Design a protein around this ligand. Structure first.
Ligand SMILES: Nc1nc2c(ncn2[C@@H]2O[C@H](COP(=O)(O)OP(=O)(O)NP(=O)(O)O)[C@@H](O)[C@H]2O)c(=O)[nH]1
Lengths: 431, 431
């Protein structure tokens, strides 16, 4: 179809950046519709390595318009830093990047709440919560937060700000016993960029509607894993926003019936970062092997992610929630050399009952036994292969099986970090 | 299509109850996916007139199953009230109703927070003092709240309740200087009906997928007006949750691509309750005529029910947001007797530009002048008419200009309050 959605179908880290980058070469628009400054996309800005957490990689492409829909919470501090880093590198950001007037603003006190909460709520251990995303979403639903559009009328901005801050400072001092955030500073910091921020504001919904009508290629990229969905993920080990493809309408303004193709980035094996149920998890040699061959490390205070086999049950849930059109399998090569490969085909419940659906209504994941299916592995490398013929039969059978168990075709296969190492069996846009 | 979404396209009060009752004769499943206990649907049963704000109207039907999706914030109190009302009028609710374990719970403290907030700074203003929908949504986003699914583990429920009730009581007492909320009571109030609740629990998205395979008729029911959507409405004069068709996916777990038809309920003229932009508002005898002849005097639900001409510029935004498939024009009869009739086709901006798209959700709305296209009216009666030949050439001309300005057909036309006072040109289910 023409409106393409690309998201992670598991618990994050599916390896979606390369796919996103490759699909941006044919797209007219790239739209972020959820999350905040946590996109995590590492790019090579002419020899120099750089990560982008807010601005879409489509920004590097000359004929592409990068859009930040109302679903993304925007820290002005974060955008300016990225804008400057990019413009410093020759990229004319301010003319390829558009924002919604409805984006919720993340200010100092928002981050302050997070920092405060992690101390008490969590503990003195890897408590990386410095961001302020959640609090921004919270103020949004409580109808007490600020939006980019509010910057258009300064007088009111200041009044609105003042009120939300006294409310927040109260909690900071009298409940968390943290410092208060200074009002004048927030106001001055924000007013300092108000004209920049609102100069990039556009009527996003109408814009996208015009593109749809003209048949332009529009790519919607999700930043977090499907199973981290606040609503359908594994509560409470979920993020502050909806991550499923259904979040595209709300977070961008485009109607639901306009999603043509939903590309689900699927990793060959599974990983999880932190607490949460993970039935296929491996606590042995094979695990350690996936972690090593896959380089499943943080790249920042990395404690080394949890590994395990591909969970077909877990993936069936994501097919449902996202109405997946096809998969893009990644890291197939990471498995190169395993005498045998496993894939969970069902969960066995404590009572004996076997299921193809993931746990609901309490009766938690606490005791699901994974029913695996053992496949022989392959020795012949799959790294770099650019055609289904370079792929050994074993590799093919495995892929073949995933398709059968899910009922969704693997339309793209990734076999290396570079863009040339990619197999396209269908193509999201022209099909 | 088998999956039908139905909602009002303006600021509510579009006359959708009748349509929903109608469409409910073919629906196998009727689902609520957004908001809370502010969805007023009036009905007659044991000769008495009963109003439901939570339970789906389809509860009257026998071979229909009603479902409250995870998108609805649920108040046990309000669920027991309606439940009992129906049990009393001989309807086996326990049998026909189903609920998501992911529905956030609304407890007394949430109502306290809401009430404290508006019955405070700026008493005579616009904020809260009511149902407690925003606080429950907020707890959900902060991830500190309780879900229907917590009722299974009664032990964990009681301590969880204590941790969160401690957090709000502090707020209530110290910041609002208000009565705290007795924990023992809330705990006792929820235990009293926990078992009742957990029995109605089901995996909703798994259930909606099976229905989708066997071809069952699923009607998704919207509760508020489209232009009141938290994100895309006439902010700040907005409601608590999302009101556009975008929430069916996040709100029920149904994949976005599986929505077949979106029916937008559309009143033949405009109304709005309370504060807020309203470009086509009347300040002459006509606005008084449309109110009196339309029974809009704080009748169905109001207090400040302003009246005006239909706004195609606003209606087009509604088309855009919901991917409208077809319109159902309601209260055609109200315009019976008018000399002329008007439609807003463009907004003149205070500067001077004449636009056709909704100005940004924060611009000179109170300062925008609507451009109208006038049309001859009809002395003949439309009321009661049950066949489009029986409608006057003037009427079936107005009908066509709406079609032509919105670019969406009107598949159903309501000519009076009786169920039989309806014309179904197409039927969302067969389309
Ligand atoms: N004359 C006339 N009355 C109508 C028509 N459709 C509905 N009504 C009447 O006008 C009101 C419409 O309200 P109702 O059908 O309850 O829907 P609603 O209150 O808009 N639904 P919600 O509040 O959930 O959006 C009712 O009092 C109803 O009897 C119509 O086409 N013509």
């Amino acid at each position: 179809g023409n409106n393409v959605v690309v998201l992670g179908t598991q618990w994050g880290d599916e390896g979606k950046g390369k796919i996103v980058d490759l699909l941006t070469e044919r797209a007219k628009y790239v739209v972020r519709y959820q999350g905040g400054h946590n996109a995590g996309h590492t790019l090579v800005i002419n020899g120099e390595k750089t990560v982008l957490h807010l601005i879409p990689s489509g920004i590097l492409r000359e004929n592409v318009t990068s859009i930040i829909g109302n679903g993304v919470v925007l820290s002005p501090a974060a955008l300016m830093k990225e804008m400057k880093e990019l413009e410093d590198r020759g990229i004319p950001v301010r003319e390829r990047l558009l924002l919604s007037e409805a984006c919720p603003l993340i200010l100092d006190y928002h981050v302050a709440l997070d920092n405060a909460r992690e101390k008490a709520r969590g503990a003195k251990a890897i408590g990386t919560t410095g961001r302020g995303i959640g609090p921004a979403y919270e103020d949004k639903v409580a109808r007490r937060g600020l939006r980019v559009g509010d910057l258009f009328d300064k007088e009111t901005f200041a009044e609105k700000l003042k009120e939300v801050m006294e409310y927040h400072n109260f909690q900071l001092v009298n409940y968390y016993k943290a410092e208060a955030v200074d009002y004048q500073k927030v106001l001055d910091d924000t007013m300092a960029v108000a004209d920049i921020l609102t100069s990039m504001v556009v009527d996003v919904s109408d814009l996208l509607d015009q593109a749809r009508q003209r048949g332009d290629f529009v790519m919607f990229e999700g930043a977090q894993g499907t199973l981290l969905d606040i609503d359908h993920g594994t509560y409470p080990y979920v993020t502050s926003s909806n991550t499923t493809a259904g979040g595209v309408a709300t977070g961008s303004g485009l109607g639901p019936r306009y999603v043509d193709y939903v590309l689900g980035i699927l990793k060959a094996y599974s990983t999880r970062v932190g607490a949460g149920p993970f039935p296929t998890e491996l606590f042995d040699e094979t695990g350690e092997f996936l972690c090593k061959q896959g380089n499943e490390f943080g790249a920042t205070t990395g404690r080394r992610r949890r590994t395990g086999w591909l969970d077909t049950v877990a993936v069936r849930r994501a097919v449902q929630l996202n109405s997946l059109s096809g998969f893009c399998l990644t890291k197939l090569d990471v498995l190169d050399g395993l005498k045998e490969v496993k894939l969970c085909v069902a969960y066995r419940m404590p009572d004996g009952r076997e299921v193809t659906t993931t746990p609901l209504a309490a009766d938690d994941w606490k005791g699901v036994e994974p029913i695996y299916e053992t496949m022989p592995g392959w020795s012949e490398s799959t790294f770099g292969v650019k055609d289904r013929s370079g792929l050994p039969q074993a590799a093919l059978n495995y892929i073949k099986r995933i398709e059968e168990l899910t009922g969704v075709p693997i339309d793209i296969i990734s076999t290396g970090p570079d863009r040339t190492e990619t197999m396209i069996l269908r193509d999201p846009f022209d099909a």
